[PDB]
Design a protein around this ligand. Structure first.
Ligand SMILES: *[C@@H]1O[C@H](CO)[C@@H](O[C@@H]2O[C@H](CO)[C@@H](O[C@@H]3O[C@H](CO[C@H]4O[C@H](CO)[C@@H](O)[C@H](O[C@H]5O[C@H](CO)[C@@H](O)[C@H](O)[C@@H]5O[C@H]5O[C@H](CO)[C@@H](O)[C@H](O)[C@@H]5O)[C@@H]4O)[C@@H](O)[C@H](O[C@H]4O[C@H](CO)[C@@H](O)[C@H](O)[C@@H]4O[C@H]4O[C@H](CO)[C@@H](O)[C@H](O)[C@@H]4O)[C@@H]3O)[C@H](O)[C@H]2NC(C)=O)[C@H](O)[C@H]1NC(C)=O
Ligand code: Y6X
Ligand code: CA
Ligand code: CA
Ligand code: K
Ligand code: NA
Ligand code: ZN
Length: 807
């Protein structure tokens, strides 16, 4: 390691805020972790004498600087009283014993320019501990009941510690901030990141801009967020309280506490082992020390406190391990990053025999109850946002909750007794964690719906008056947590205006190789057809306004009896198709005579249309329709569903999924939700960056054509939250579920796909559930432009994820 001159001194420097560089010895809260503290750091900065609590006998003692904390009359002015000083010595109450009283305005001491923010972060604090441990956590239960709380907060994938803490700090997905696991190899650096050792302290791992840097760059001082493991929790609290006693111009406005518990014990004992009660009690006692200490400093109605976890904890035992050696012939030629997720790469880049395709195949649906599923990273559910980083191996194993994956059996017993772990898919209930906000800027006695931890950075910025660095939150989506300091964004400006084409082409101008048995012949209904094509039913089918197109392109709005679309002249297909299905709608067949019907659209030039010949010649690719012919309002309207402008390229394997969605599931949802509005369309994300591809990024076309092949198909399914009102006459808040289905040429993902669609398609769709915001990123469209609802409410709706977990 680098040389440090430990012969310097921490006198007058204990828990200094500014870092000093090698070779200078350190006195900060992380110095122990770098083995670089000055020789007298323990003696001066980690005093322990007489413990952490005042007692009657110590009240008004002569100050003894040796003591861990003080009970002398000068201690409040020095800022170093034991947290219970005023209770024991001055007849005050513990904070927890005081009634909840609304904090309508900050009540801060003179010299405080803004309410400080204290983040109280807890590792492995599973969401359900707030109910199941409530009898042993009175301080936490008071924060929860009196402040603003969610029933749970969704972590990021993988549900590991450093990825989640750093997402809290940055607002970024792991793929963007770079901490993609607790273990990583970076092929460009040729460097490895591990929990143990020095490499993880190198700045090149840590991307984005974390909150303490955002603060500092904008003139807001920060406490150092990382605490060496051996610093007792009592000392971390005392350190924060001492910093809060610094002069105004020296004093931070943002702070973080961290606890390794309950994660540490949860690994040993399982999430609900009897041994878990004590760690929860201890954390609660720490919270009480903080709050008593704030009360002493007259800050308990001034500071905003966030109580937040990184991830939950699941029951996992050594016996529930899958071994790759039971699947692969070649297990010595791979490197596996193991555990609650798998990542596989070649052991040697000089091995020309390594082949990811044969590895995937050998891992796919090989054992009936197989407890992991292999994916190429681009095929992972888009909601995980887990692909666009060179540190993420191409081959990924999604491991079932309660299981591990390992390379060989000896890997498990050459080192177990553990009973808990985490890392699984971030929709899994056991992985959910906690959020409580308490203070003047948060709401009083308020429950908010579950939300994702990527959203918190923005809020913490709002709490501190900071402009957030660019991040993956949706700023304004959490305004409903806040009494004040809301962020009031404007809707993005539409970049491309639509064309509204009329009838401009004769049938014979088209030479598309299409056919349709549609030659059948009325002045009464002549006018009706013309009205429908000029948009007379658009209010029924486009319920929340046209989506706005946020990039430069050429597209047409096309109206029909049963659906409206925004048709791209560049991609030769809709960007979006919008239609409403009432609870009373009937499903019908595709008539025998229309099975292979495709019809030219006389509003759209031959040159801006798909053609049927390309599909005939492309022996791998077929086609489907975005507005489903099955849900036509009448036999005559059904002809509109067969327009070439409603056609999209679909692999036969995918058509099985799509047809079941369209013929069975849409009507099921309309029945259950009292009507639904559906917006469906293609997505192109060939570079797996979560963002709309430009034309030049497209890697596959329908053979012999310029018709690009989507990587995914989306649908956004909206109805009235009050399901006593039909989707098309909803006066209040909305309810949404969405999906982003991978457009794959096989159903290998679905191990039961040989069975009828009723046994597997809906399961696939649930796995590929999505937020509206995910679709916005992937399409460059902006939805819900014209509703009766507040914009912040709509932002919340766009971040909603339908998870399909139990309670
Ligand atoms: C979630 O939120 C985040 C944040 O808003 C979104 O990420 C942004 O998306 C942008 C598009 O993908 C991306 O913009 C690019 O930035 C390039 C330079 O970036 C550097 O500087 C910024 C600013 O300080 C910094 O944040 C970057 O940090 C990344 O890289 C470092 C390593 O150096 C990492 O430590 C860090 O974690 C982060 O890595 C992540 O992003 C990079 C991409 O930058 C990925 O590769 C990583 O895997 C990881 O995900 C950088 O230090 C900039 O140079 C780009 O400009 C090109 O594009 C335009 C397009 O027209 C073109 O005109 C330009 O000429 C240029 O092209 C030329 O270079 C091409 C690339 O080599 C070349 O092929 C061409 O031929 C051209 O010569 C571009 O603007 C932005 O960096 C990230 N920011 C972050 C923090 O990740 C993210 O999209 C959101 N996610 C979702 C789903 O919404
Ligand atoms: N990023 C981030 C972030 C974001 C928020 Cl909102 C709060 C906090 C954080 C960070 C956290 N402090 C914290 N985390 C981990 C550790 C830890 O593990 N350490 C220190 C040495 C070892 C490495 O192995 C043992 C210590 N301290 C408090
Ligand atoms: Ca953790
Ligand atoms: Ca893309
Ligand atoms: K074909
Ligand atoms: Na299958
Ligand atoms: Zn852990």
């Amino acid at each position: 390691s680098p040389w440090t001159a430990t012969s310097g001194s921490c006198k007058g420097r204990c828990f200094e805020l500014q870092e000093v560089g090698p070779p200078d010895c350190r006195c900060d809260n992380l110095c122990k972790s770098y083995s670089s503290c000055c020789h007298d750091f323990d003696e001066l900065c980690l005093k322990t004498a007489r413990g952490w609590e005042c007692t009657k006998d110590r009240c008004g003692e002569v100050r003894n600087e040796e003591n861990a904390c003080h009970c002398s009359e000068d201690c409040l002015s020095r800022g170093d009283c034991c947290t219970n000083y005023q209770v024991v010595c001055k007849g005050e109450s513990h904070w927890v014993d005081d009634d909840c009283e609304e904090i309508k305005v900050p009540e801060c001491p003179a010299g405080f320019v803004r309410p400080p923010l204290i983040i109280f972060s807890v590792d492995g604090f599973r969401a359900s501990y707030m109910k199941k441990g409530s009898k042993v956590m009175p301080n936490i239960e008071k924060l929860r009941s009196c402040g603003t709380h969610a029933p749970y907060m969704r972590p990021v994938y993988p549900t590991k510690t450093f990825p989640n803490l750093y997402t809290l700090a940055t607002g970024l997905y792991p793929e963007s901030h770079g901490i993609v696991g607790n273990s990583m190899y970076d092929p460009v650096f040729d460097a490895s990141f591990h929990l143990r050792g020095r490499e993880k302290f190198n700045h090149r791992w840590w991307g984005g801009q974390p909150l303490w840097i955002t603060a500092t760059k904008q003139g807001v001082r920060a406490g150092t967020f990382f605490w060496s493991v051996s610093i007792p929790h009592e000392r971390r609290i005392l350190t924060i309280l001492q910093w809060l006693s610094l002069p105004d111009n020296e004093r931070p406005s943002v702070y973080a506490f961290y606890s390794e518990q309950p994660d540490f014990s949860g690994h040993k004992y399982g999430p609900f082992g009897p041994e878990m009660t004590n760690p929860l009690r201890e954390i609660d006692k720490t919270v009480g020390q903080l709050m008593d200490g704030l009360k002493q400093l007259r800050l308990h109605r001034c500071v905003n406190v966030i109580f937040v976890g990184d991830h939950g904890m699941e029951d996992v035992t050594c016996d529930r391990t899958e071994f790759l050696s039971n699947y692969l012939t070649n297990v010595d030629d791979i490197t596996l990053v193991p555990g609650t997720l798998g990542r596989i790469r070649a052991k040697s880049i000089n091995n020309s025999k390594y082949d990811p395709k044969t590895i995937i195949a050998a891992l796919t649906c090989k054992k009936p109850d197989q407890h992991f599923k292999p994916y190429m990273k681009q095929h992972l559910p888009k909601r995980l946002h887990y692909a666009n980083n060179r540190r993420i191996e191409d081959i990924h194993l999604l491991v079932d909750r309660r299981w591990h994956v390992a390379r060989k059996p000896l890997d498990v017993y050459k080192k177990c007794f553990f009973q808990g772990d985490h890392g699984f898919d971030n929709k899994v209930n056991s992985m959910q964690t906690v959020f409580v906000g308490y203070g003047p800027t948060f709401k009083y006695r308020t429950k908010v719906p579950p939300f994702e931890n990527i959203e918190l950075y923005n809020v913490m910025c709002d709490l501190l008056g900071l402009k957030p660095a660019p991040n993956n939150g949706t700023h304004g989506s959490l305004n409903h947590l806040l009494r004040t300091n809301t962020f009031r964004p404007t809707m993005p400006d539409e970049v491309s205006r639509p064309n509204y084409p009329g009838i401009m082409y004769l049938q014979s101008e088209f030479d598309l190789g299409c056919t349709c048995d549609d030659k059948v012949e009325n002045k009464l209904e002549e006018l009706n057809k013309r009205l429908h094509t000029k948009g007379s039913t658009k209010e029924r089918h486009l319920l929340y306004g046209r989506p706005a197109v946020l990039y430069r392109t050429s597209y047409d709005i096309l109206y029909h009896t049963d659906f409206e679309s925004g048709y791209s002249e560049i991609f030769l297909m809709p960007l979006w198709t919008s239609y409403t299905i009432s609870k009373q709608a009937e499903v019908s067949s595709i008539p025998e005579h229309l099975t292979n019907c495709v019809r030219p659209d006389v509003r759209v030039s031959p040159g801006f249309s798909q053609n049927c010949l390309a599909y005939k010649n492309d022996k791998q690719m077929s086609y489907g329709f975005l507005f489903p012919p099955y849900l036509s309002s009448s036999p005559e309207a059904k002809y509109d569903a067969f327009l070439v402008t409603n056609m999209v390229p679909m692999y036969p394997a995918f058509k099985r999924v799509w047809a079941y969605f369209q013929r069975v599931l849409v009507k099921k949802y309309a029945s259950e939700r009292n009507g639904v509005n559906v917006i469906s369309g293609p997505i192109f994300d060939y570079n797996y960056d979560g963002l709309r591809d430009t034309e030049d990024e497209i890697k596959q076309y329908v053979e012999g054509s310029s018709i690009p092949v989507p990587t995914h198909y989306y649908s956004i399914i909206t109805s009235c939250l009050d399901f006593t009102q039909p989707a098309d006459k909803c006066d209040g808040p909305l309810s949404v579920s969405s999906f982003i289905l991978p457009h794959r040429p096989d159903n290998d993902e679905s191990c039961n796909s040989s069975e009828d669609e009723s046994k597997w398609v809906e399961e696939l769709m649930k796995m590929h559930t999505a937020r509206v915001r995910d679709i916005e990123h992937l399409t460059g469209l902006d939805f819900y432009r014209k509703t009766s609802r507040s914009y912040s409410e709509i932002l919340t709706l766009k971040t909603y994820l339908h998870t399909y977990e139990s309670e």
